[PDB]
């Protein structure tokens, strides 16, 4: 199924330190970050996605059509300009940002009642897993 609809909770976090050391964010707020659960709220109609990644400690919006590159600024994650395109492998979705950082972007699919996640940067994978809430 390509449909991500839905407000998910997270169920478990794999080295996400090791991703937001690849994309160089400072000791402080790594250290604060790996610690929390996170909730990522997907709005999808058709190609149009909007995304939001929430933690008590921050806010990270973006909306995004299939298969549209746009130009981005990565604002409070790492502050860096990107282009990213975000297309369907299969039922797989997924991002590539093309910048200074190689192998970025993320993957998105769904397992039954749950969405998981890889989040790449260099040599690091992040793995995730949400529940539908
Ligand atoms: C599809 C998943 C996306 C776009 C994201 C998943 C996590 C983030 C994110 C983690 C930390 C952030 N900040 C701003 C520290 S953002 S985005």
């Given at each position: 199924?390509?449909?991500?609809?839905?407000?998910?909770?997270?169920?478990?976090?794999?080295?996400?330190?090791?991703?937001?050391?690849?994309?160089?964010?400072?000791?402080?707020?790594?250290?604060?970050?790996?610690?929390?659960?996170?909730?990522?709220?997907?709005?999808?109609?058709?190609?149009?996605?909007?995304?939001?990644?929430?933690?008590?400690?921050?806010?990270?919006?973006?909306d995004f059509?299939?298969g549209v590159?746009?130009?981005?600024?990565?604002?409070?994650?790492?502050?860096?300009?990107?282009k990213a395109?975000?297309?369907?492998?299969?039922?797989?979705?997924?991002?590539?940002?093309?910048?200074?950082?190689?192998?970025?972007?993320?993957?998105?699919?769904?397992?039954?009642?749950?969405?998981?996640?890889?989040?790449?940067?260099?040599?690091?994978?992040?793995?995730?897993?949400?529940?539908?809430?």
């Open positions: 199924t390509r449909d991500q609809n839905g407000t998910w909770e997270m169920e478990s976090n794999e080295n996400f330190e090791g991703w937001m050391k690849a994309l160089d964010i400072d000791f402080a707020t790594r250290k604060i970050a790996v610690r929390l659960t996170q909730t990522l709220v997907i709005d999808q109609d058709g190609d149009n996605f909007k995304v939001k990644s929430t933690s008590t400690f921050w806010n990270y919006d973006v059509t299939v590159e746009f130009d981005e600024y990565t604002k409070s994650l790492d502050n860096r300009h990107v395109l975000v297309t369907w492998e299969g039922d797989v979705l997924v991002c590539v940002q093309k910048g200074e950082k190689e192998n970025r972007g993320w993957k998105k699919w769904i397992e039954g009642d749950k969405l998981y996640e890889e989040l790449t940067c260099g040599d690091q994978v992040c793995r995730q897993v949400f529940k539908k809430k």
